[PDB]
């Protein structure tokens, strides 16, 4: 019925493959970018990797207790036993998540470890009728689930201001006011292909793992509700994006509450 134009765009780099299918036109699997499973740089970011600067926990358990320092950094550890965000998690103004790290006394299978375990959902790159390429889930995803990370090239504020191919930028704005950006234009993972939706089934959360340099949160998408098998993924690109692109095209997310139609 369709055309399986790839068995895995990640070439085996993700825990689970991410095929590409096109059921709509003759466009072959996208190849104008380099798939990378983790953030890269093409120009020094002086990410603070000094291991003695990490805050870490000394838990003698599985990091379920109120005493876990890494949990305290996050407000509380928001993950349940299955790895899902607690119902009480604020998806409107998500807190910063600090996962346990290699400086912690705890074990690798501790509770406070989710994003760092990589992809667990079966996803698929497919051709949409209205929006170019998009990503859909191939199975039921429960709410509060880690789905994928927004991966690309870490660049500076001012370098980002000169990028002419600007449809793949993700701004990292510190609470301190400092700003960097992830550009998935040339180097990126499956998240570069996730389209905007006005009623999103995904929310991005800033997460820290092997480093705690606050200029460089890593961006994790968690489901905000049950996503059904076959359902396209989407998050809210936000207002800064639309104030600019809205001059060139309109949102075709198709929602009856579409805010950018």
């Amino acid at each position: 019925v369709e055309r399986i134009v790839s068995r895995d765009i990640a070439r085996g780099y993700e825990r689970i493959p991410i095929p590409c299918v096109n059921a709509v036109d003759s466009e072959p699997c996208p190849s104008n970018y380099k798939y990378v499973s983790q953030n890269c740089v093409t120009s020094p970011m002086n990410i603070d990797r000094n291991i003695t600067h990490l805050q870490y926990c000394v838990c003698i358990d599985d990091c379920s207790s109120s005493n876990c320092m890494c949990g305290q950094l996050s407000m509380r550890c928001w993950y349940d036993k299955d790895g899902r965000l607690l119902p009480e998690f604020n998806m409107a103004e998500p807190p910063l998540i600090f996962e346990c790290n290699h400086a912690c006394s705890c074990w690798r299978n501790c509770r406070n470890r989710v994003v760092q375990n990589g992809l667990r959902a079966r996803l698929q790159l497919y051709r949409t009728r209205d929006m170019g390429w998009g990503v859909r889930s191939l199975q039921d995803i429960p709410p509060g689930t880690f789905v994928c990370e927004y991966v690309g090239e870490l660049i500076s504020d001012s370098e980002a201001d000169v990028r002419e191919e600007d449809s793949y930028l993700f701004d990292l704005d510190n609470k301190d006011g400092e700003v960097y950006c992830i550009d998935a234009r040339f180097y990126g993972n499956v998240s570069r292909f996730i389209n905007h939706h006005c009623e999103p089934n995904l929310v991005p959360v800033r997460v820290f793992m092997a480093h705690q340099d606050l200029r460089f949160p890593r961006i994790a998408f968690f489901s905000t509700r049950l996503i059904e098998a076959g359902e396209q993924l989407g998050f809210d690109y936000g207002e800064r994006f639309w104030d600019i692109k809205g001059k060139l095209f309109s949102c075709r997310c198709g929602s009856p509450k579409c805010r950018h139609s």
């Binding site: 449809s167 701004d171 690109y237 936000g238 207002e239 800064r240 994006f241």
Partner: peptide, 9 residues
């Protein structure tokens, strides 16, 4: 100028 078309919101 304009500005930059970054996510999110």
């Amino acid at each position: 100028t304009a500005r930059k078309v970054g996510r999110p919101g």
